[PDB]
Amino acid sequence: MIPETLVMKPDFIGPAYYEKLGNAPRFIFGKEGKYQRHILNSEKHGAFHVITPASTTVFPEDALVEVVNPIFLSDTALNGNSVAPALNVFAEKLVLKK
């Protein structure tokens, strides 16, 4: 009965401002590769960190991009900072729209 999930998962659904792209993730889940990490900020969570495999498509900052299915960290029960923008998830993809 508590206002929590209206559609699916607020964070994921809610588009976020494209802050900056910083290359850093090289080895995830014991697997090497070339990943581009981008900071995304949206009021509901303030901010959140999404990792995505290196694409050729860039994304103008300030713009709202939509994050495709991100998995790495799950806000299930207790994560300590479950109300602070210290989220770290590997997103499928992301698209700038509106």
CSV table of N, CA, C and O in Angstrom, one decimal, residues 29-92:
chain,number,residue,atom,x,y,z
A,29,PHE,N,32.5,-9.0,-14.1
A,29,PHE,CA,32.2,-10.3,-13.9
A,29,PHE,C,33.3,-11.3,-14.4
A,29,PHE,O,33.0,-12.4,-14.8
A,30,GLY,N,34.5,-10.8,-14.2
A,30,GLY,CA,35.7,-11.6,-14.6
A,30,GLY,C,35.8,-11.7,-16.1
A,30,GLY,O,36.5,-12.6,-16.6
A,31,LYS,N,35.2,-10.8,-16.8
A,31,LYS,CA,35.3,-10.8,-18.2
A,31,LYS,C,35.8,-9.4,-18.7
A,31,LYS,O,35.4,-8.4,-18.3
A,32,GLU,N,36.8,-9.5,-19.6
A,32,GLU,CA,37.5,-8.3,-20.1
A,32,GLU,C,36.6,-7.7,-21.3
A,32,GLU,O,35.8,-8.4,-21.9
A,33,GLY,N,36.9,-6.5,-21.6
A,33,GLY,CA,36.2,-5.8,-22.7
A,33,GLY,C,36.4,-4.4,-22.7
A,33,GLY,O,37.3,-3.9,-22.0
A,34,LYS,N,35.7,-3.6,-23.5
A,34,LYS,CA,35.8,-2.2,-23.6
A,34,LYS,C,34.5,-1.6,-23.3
A,34,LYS,O,33.5,-1.6,-24.1
A,35,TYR,N,34.3,-1.0,-22.1
A,35,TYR,CA,33.0,-0.5,-21.7
A,35,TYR,C,33.1,1.0,-21.4
A,35,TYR,O,34.2,1.5,-20.9
A,36,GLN,N,32.1,1.7,-21.7
A,36,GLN,CA,32.0,3.1,-21.5
A,36,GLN,C,30.9,3.4,-20.4
A,36,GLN,O,29.8,3.1,-20.6
A,37,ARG,N,31.4,4.0,-19.4
A,37,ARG,CA,30.5,4.3,-18.2
A,37,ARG,C,30.0,5.8,-18.4
A,37,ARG,O,30.8,6.7,-18.7
A,38,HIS,N,28.7,6.0,-18.1
A,38,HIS,CA,28.2,7.3,-18.2
A,38,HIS,C,27.3,7.6,-17.0
A,38,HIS,O,26.6,6.7,-16.5
A,39,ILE,N,27.5,8.8,-16.5
A,39,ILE,CA,26.7,9.3,-15.3
A,39,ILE,C,25.4,9.8,-15.8
A,39,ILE,O,25.3,10.7,-16.7
A,40,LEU,N,24.3,9.3,-15.2
A,40,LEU,CA,23.0,9.7,-15.5
A,40,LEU,C,22.3,10.2,-14.3
A,40,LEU,O,22.3,9.6,-13.3
A,41,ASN,N,21.6,11.3,-14.4
A,41,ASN,CA,21.0,12.0,-13.2
A,41,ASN,C,19.6,12.3,-13.5
A,41,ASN,O,19.2,13.0,-14.4
A,42,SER,N,18.7,11.8,-12.6
A,42,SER,CA,17.3,12.0,-12.7
A,42,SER,C,16.7,12.2,-11.3
A,42,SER,O,17.1,11.4,-10.4
A,43,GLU,N,15.7,13.1,-11.1
A,43,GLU,CA,15.3,13.6,-9.8
A,43,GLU,C,14.9,12.5,-8.8
A,43,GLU,O,15.3,12.5,-7.7
A,44,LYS,N,14.3,11.4,-9.3
A,44,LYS,CA,13.8,10.3,-8.5
A,44,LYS,C,14.9,9.7,-7.7
A,44,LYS,O,14.7,9.4,-6.5
A,45,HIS,N,16.1,9.6,-8.3
A,45,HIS,CA,17.2,8.9,-7.6
A,45,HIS,C,18.4,9.9,-7.5
A,45,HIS,O,19.4,9.6,-7.0
A,46,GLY,N,18.1,11.1,-8.0
A,46,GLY,CA,19.2,12.1,-8.1
A,46,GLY,C,20.2,11.8,-9.2
A,46,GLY,O,20.3,12.5,-10.2
A,47,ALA,N,20.9,10.7,-9.0
A,47,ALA,CA,21.9,10.2,-10.0
A,47,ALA,C,22.0,8.7,-10.0
A,47,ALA,O,21.3,8.0,-9.1
A,48,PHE,N,22.6,8.1,-10.9
A,48,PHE,CA,23.0,6.7,-10.9
A,48,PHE,C,24.0,6.4,-12.0
A,48,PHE,O,24.1,7.1,-13.0
A,49,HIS,N,24.8,5.4,-11.8
A,49,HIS,CA,25.9,5.1,-12.7
A,49,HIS,C,25.6,3.9,-13.5
A,49,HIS,O,25.3,2.8,-13.0
A,50,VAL,N,25.6,4.1,-14.8
A,50,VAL,CA,25.3,3.0,-15.8
A,50,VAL,C,26.5,2.7,-16.6
A,50,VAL,O,27.2,3.5,-17.2
A,51,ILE,N,26.8,1.4,-16.7
A,51,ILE,CA,27.9,0.9,-17.6
A,51,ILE,C,27.3,0.3,-18.8
A,51,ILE,O,26.2,-0.3,-18.8
A,52,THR,N,28.0,0.6,-19.9
A,52,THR,CA,27.5,0.1,-21.2
A,52,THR,C,28.7,-0.2,-22.1
A,52,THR,O,29.6,0.6,-22.1
A,53,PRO,N,28.6,-1.2,-22.9
A,53,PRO,CA,29.7,-1.6,-23.9
A,53,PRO,C,30.0,-0.5,-24.8
A,53,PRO,O,29.1,0.2,-25.3
A,54,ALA,N,31.3,-0.3,-25.1
A,54,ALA,CA,31.7,0.8,-26.0
A,54,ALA,C,31.0,0.8,-27.3
A,54,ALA,O,31.1,-0.1,-28.1
A,55,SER,N,30.2,1.9,-27.6
A,55,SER,CA,29.5,2.1,-28.8
A,55,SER,C,30.2,3.2,-29.6
A,55,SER,O,31.1,3.8,-29.1
A,56,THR,N,29.7,3.3,-30.8
A,56,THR,CA,30.2,4.4,-31.7
A,56,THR,C,29.3,5.6,-31.6
A,56,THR,O,29.6,6.7,-32.1
A,57,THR,N,28.1,5.4,-31.1
A,57,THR,CA,27.1,6.4,-30.9
A,57,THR,C,27.5,7.2,-29.6
A,57,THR,O,27.6,6.6,-28.5
A,58,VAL,N,27.6,8.5,-29.7
A,58,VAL,CA,27.8,9.4,-28.6
A,58,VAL,C,26.5,10.0,-28.2
A,58,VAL,O,25.5,9.9,-28.9
A,59,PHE,N,26.5,10.6,-27.0
A,59,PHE,CA,25.2,11.1,-26.5
A,59,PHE,C,25.5,12.5,-25.9
A,59,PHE,O,26.2,12.7,-24.9
A,60,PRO,N,24.9,13.6,-26.6
A,60,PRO,CA,25.0,14.9,-26.1
A,60,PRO,C,24.5,15.0,-24.6
A,60,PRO,O,23.5,14.5,-24.3
A,61,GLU,N,25.3,15.7,-23.8
A,61,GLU,CA,25.0,15.8,-22.4
A,61,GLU,C,23.8,16.7,-22.1
A,61,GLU,O,23.4,17.4,-23.0
A,62,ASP,N,23.3,16.7,-20.9
A,62,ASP,CA,22.1,17.5,-20.5
A,62,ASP,C,20.9,16.9,-21.0
A,62,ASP,O,19.8,17.0,-20.4
A,63,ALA,N,21.0,16.2,-22.1
A,63,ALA,CA,19.8,15.5,-22.8
A,63,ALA,C,19.3,14.3,-22.0
A,63,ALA,O,20.1,13.7,-21.3
A,64,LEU,N,18.1,14.0,-22.1
A,64,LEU,CA,17.5,12.9,-21.5
A,64,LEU,C,17.6,11.6,-22.4
A,64,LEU,O,17.0,11.6,-23.5
A,65,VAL,N,18.3,10.7,-21.9
A,65,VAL,CA,18.5,9.4,-22.5
A,65,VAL,C,17.7,8.3,-21.7
A,65,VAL,O,17.6,8.5,-20.5
A,66,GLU,N,17.2,7.3,-22.4
A,66,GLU,CA,16.5,6.2,-21.7
A,66,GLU,C,17.4,5.0,-21.6
A,66,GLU,O,18.0,4.6,-22.5
A,67,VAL,N,17.5,4.5,-20.4
A,67,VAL,CA,18.3,3.3,-20.1
A,67,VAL,C,17.6,2.0,-20.3
A,67,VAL,O,16.5,1.8,-19.8
A,68,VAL,N,18.2,1.1,-21.1
A,68,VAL,CA,17.7,-0.2,-21.3
A,68,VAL,C,18.2,-1.1,-20.2
A,68,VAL,O,19.1,-0.7,-19.4
A,69,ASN,N,17.7,-2.4,-20.1
A,69,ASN,CA,17.7,-3.1,-18.9
A,69,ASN,C,19.0,-3.3,-18.2
A,69,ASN,O,19.9,-4.0,-18.7
A,70,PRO,N,19.2,-2.5,-17.1
A,70,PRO,CA,20.5,-2.5,-16.3
A,70,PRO,C,20.5,-3.5,-15.2
A,70,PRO,O,19.5,-3.5,-14.4
A,71,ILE,N,21.5,-4.3,-15.1
A,71,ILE,CA,21.7,-5.3,-14.0
A,71,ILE,C,23.1,-5.3,-13.5
A,71,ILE,O,24.0,-5.2,-14.3
A,72,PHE,N,23.2,-5.4,-12.2
A,72,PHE,CA,24.5,-5.4,-11.5
A,72,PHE,C,24.3,-5.3,-10.0
A,72,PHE,O,24.9,-6.0,-9.2
A,73,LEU,N,23.4,-4.4,-9.6
A,73,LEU,CA,23.1,-4.1,-8.3
A,73,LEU,C,21.5,-4.0,-8.1
A,73,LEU,O,20.9,-3.3,-8.9
A,74,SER,N,21.0,-4.7,-7.1
A,74,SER,CA,19.5,-4.7,-7.0
A,74,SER,C,19.1,-4.2,-5.7
A,74,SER,O,19.5,-4.6,-4.6
A,75,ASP,N,18.2,-3.2,-5.7
A,75,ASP,CA,17.6,-2.6,-4.5
A,75,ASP,C,16.5,-3.4,-4.0
A,75,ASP,O,15.3,-3.0,-4.2
A,76,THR,N,16.8,-4.6,-3.5
A,76,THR,CA,15.8,-5.5,-3.1
A,76,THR,C,15.4,-5.2,-1.6
A,76,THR,O,14.3,-4.8,-1.3
A,77,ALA,N,16.3,-5.5,-0.7
A,77,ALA,CA,16.0,-5.4,0.7
A,77,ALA,C,16.8,-4.2,1.3
A,77,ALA,O,16.3,-3.1,1.5
A,78,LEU,N,18.0,-4.5,1.6
A,78,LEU,CA,18.9,-3.5,2.2
A,78,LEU,C,20.2,-3.4,1.4
A,78,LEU,O,20.9,-4.4,1.2
A,79,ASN,N,20.6,-2.2,1.0
A,79,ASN,CA,21.8,-1.9,0.3
A,79,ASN,C,22.6,-0.8,1.0
A,79,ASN,O,23.5,-0.2,0.4
A,80,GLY,N,22.1,-0.4,2.2
A,80,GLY,CA,22.7,0.8,2.9
A,80,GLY,C,22.3,2.1,2.3
A,80,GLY,O,21.4,2.8,2.7
A,81,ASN,N,23.0,2.4,1.2
A,81,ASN,CA,22.7,3.7,0.5
A,81,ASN,C,21.6,3.5,-0.6
A,81,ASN,O,21.8,3.8,-1.7
A,82,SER,N,20.5,2.9,-0.1
A,82,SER,CA,19.4,2.6,-1.0
A,82,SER,C,18.5,3.8,-1.3
A,82,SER,O,17.4,3.7,-1.9
A,83,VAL,N,19.0,5.0,-0.9
A,83,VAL,CA,18.3,6.2,-1.1
A,83,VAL,C,19.2,7.3,-1.5
A,83,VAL,O,18.9,8.5,-1.6
A,84,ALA,N,20.4,6.9,-1.8
A,84,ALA,CA,21.5,7.8,-2.3
A,84,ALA,C,22.0,7.4,-3.6
A,84,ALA,O,22.0,6.2,-4.0
A,85,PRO,N,22.4,8.3,-4.5
A,85,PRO,CA,22.8,8.1,-5.9
A,85,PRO,C,24.2,7.4,-6.0
A,85,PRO,O,25.1,7.9,-6.6
A,86,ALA,N,24.3,6.3,-5.3
A,86,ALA,CA,25.5,5.5,-5.4
A,86,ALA,C,25.2,4.2,-6.1
A,86,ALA,O,25.8,3.1,-5.8
A,87,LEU,N,24.3,4.2,-7.0
A,87,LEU,CA,23.8,3.0,-7.7
A,87,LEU,C,24.8,2.7,-8.9
A,87,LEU,O,25.3,3.7,-9.5
A,88,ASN,N,25.1,1.5,-9.1
A,88,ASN,CA,26.0,1.0,-10.1
A,88,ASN,C,25.4,-0.2,-10.8
A,88,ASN,O,25.5,-1.3,-10.4
A,89,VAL,N,24.9,0.1,-12.0
A,89,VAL,CA,24.3,-1.0,-12.8
A,89,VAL,C,24.8,-1.0,-14.2
A,89,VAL,O,25.1,0.0,-14.8
A,90,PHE,N,24.9,-2.2,-14.8
A,90,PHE,CA,25.3,-2.4,-16.2
A,90,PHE,C,24.0,-2.4,-17.1
A,90,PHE,O,23.2,-3.3,-17.0
A,91,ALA,N,23.9,-1.3,-17.8
A,91,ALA,CA,22.7,-1.1,-18.7
A,91,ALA,C,22.9,-1.9,-20.0
A,91,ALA,O,24.1,-2.0,-20.5
A,92,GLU,N,21.8,-2.3,-20.6
A,92,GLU,CA,21.9,-2.9,-21.9
A,92,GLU,C,22.4,-1.9,-22.9
A,92,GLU,O,23.5,-2.0,-23.5
